[PDB]
């Protein structure tokens, strides 16, 4: 956990997130929808288990991005929930929920669900 | 289960589903987006635990509706997963996933998630 989590991670689509894992279980960093532009970077914050079990278990973690920055506001927020798995081929396997602000009539279509794997290796 | 499940159920929005629970764990019936029109009725099929546990547990079940009938095709399917709970105020508490057919570029927005409670009482 901690030292293993801090770093740059890439998913299958080409998105980048840069995270620092703090000693007291805090995650802070930025998500970039594309590898090189300020207009596509968004703030993230989250938490992780800072004393994970000593058998071969993953480290549980989660984070949120609200999709507003200085250039764009998409009136929506995503949360990722998953676990870090260390070793030679470190990865974070996640499921995610994306909620949009809706009217009450449209609330049934407010939330999408999907899944994402992050690796330290950009392919 | 079975005899308790067979019947008409209503959710909070005003949708109706009519289901027969067969002796060998089959569910068959129709979902109606609104209480009185053929253009809004769709076929459902599903399965349930036909020998549930004898302590106070719910009966696990699930069903699928593909949103195509003789009048409309919305190129999408929903599955409901949950459990029947019997008694004086019988209900089926569900979570659901709605998937639309997408192009591969748009596959990230293909699936919505929500939840629904069905009661035998229309309010």
């Amino acid at each position: 956990a901690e030292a293993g989590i801090t770093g740059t991670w890439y998913n299958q689509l080409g998105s980048t997130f840069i995270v620092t894992a703090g000693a007291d279980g805090a995650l802070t960093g930025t998500y970039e929808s594309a590898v090189g532009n300020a207009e596509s970077r968004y703030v993230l914050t989250g938490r992780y288990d800072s004393a994970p079990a000593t058998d071969g278990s993953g480290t549980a973690l989660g984070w949120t991005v609200a999709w507003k920055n200085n250039y764009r506001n998409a009136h929506s927020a995503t949360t990722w929930s998953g676990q870090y798995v260390g070793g030679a081929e470190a990865r974070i396997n996640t499921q995610w929920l994306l909620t949009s602000g809706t009217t009450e009539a449209n609330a049934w279509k407010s939330t999408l669900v999907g899944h994402d794997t992050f690796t330290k290796v950009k392919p | 289960a079975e005899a308790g499940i067979t019947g008409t159920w209503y959710n909070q929005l005003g949708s109706t589903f009519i289901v027969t629970a067969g002796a060998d764990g089959a569910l068959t019936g129709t979902y109606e987006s609104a209480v009185g029109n053929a253009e809004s009725r769709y076929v459902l099929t599903g399965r349930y635990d036909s020998a549930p546990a004898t302590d106070g547990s719910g009966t696990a079940l699930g069903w699928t509706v593909a949103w195509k009938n003789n009048y409309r095709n919305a190129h999408s399917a929903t599955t409901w997963s949950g459990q029947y709970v019997g008694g004086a105020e019988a209900r089926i508490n569900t979570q659901w996933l709605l998937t639309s057919g997408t192009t591969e570029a748009n596959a990230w927005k293909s699936t919505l998630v929500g939840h629904d409670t069905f009661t035998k009482v229309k309010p």
Partner: peptide, 6 residues
């Protein structure tokens, strides 16, 4: 496209 994706 949503910024999570582009």
């Amino acid at each position: 496209c949503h910024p999570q994706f582009c």
